Amino acid sequence: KVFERCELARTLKRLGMDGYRGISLANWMCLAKWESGYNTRATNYNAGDRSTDYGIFQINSRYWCNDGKTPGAVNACHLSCSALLQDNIADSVACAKRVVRDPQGIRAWVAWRNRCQNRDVRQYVQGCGV
Numbered sequence: 001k002v003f004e005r006c007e008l009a010r011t012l013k014r015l016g017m018d019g020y021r022g023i024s025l026a027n028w029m030c031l032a033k034w035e036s037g038y039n040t041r042a043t044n045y046n047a048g049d050r051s052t053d054y055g056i057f058q059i060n061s062r063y064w065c066n067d068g069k070t071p072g073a074v075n076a077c078h079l080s081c082s083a084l085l086q087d088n089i090a091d092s093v094a095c096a097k098r099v100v101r102d103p104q105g106i107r108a109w110v111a112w113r114n115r116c117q118n119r120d121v122r123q124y125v126q127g128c129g130v
Contacts, residue, residue: 001087003038003056005029006128013130015093021100028096029124030116031109032056040092041085055084055092057099057109064095 035058036042066075077095
């Protein structure tokens with residue numbers, strides 16, 4: 001499923017993402033926007049280390065979900081990577097929360113650092129009623 005902007009903002013808010021571990025909804029929106037274009041079935045294979053990024057937040061298989069084909073990988077979210085490709089984003093949200101409970105927080109995603117960090121991200125939630 002490819003979410004429309006405000007549709008996703010409310011979906012994320014309903015899932016408890018607004019201010020989760022101090023991360024505003026606008027930050028999660030900027031993350032999803034730049035990671036997958038709000039596309040839940042997005043996948044990206046990383047030929048360099050044999051891992052794959054899954055879902056709307058492009059969560060990596062080396063540490064977060066199990067896809068069975070990533071060498072020496074772990075599954076901190078205790079989910080099959082398939083769970084991160086559903087139209088329903090509850091599992092991708094549960095896992096994204098797990099990611100940020102670690103030291104780096106939202107900084108875990110390099111795309112967040114490149115396109116969201118120290119930027120004006122208000123524009124992502126404007127008019128969405130969140």
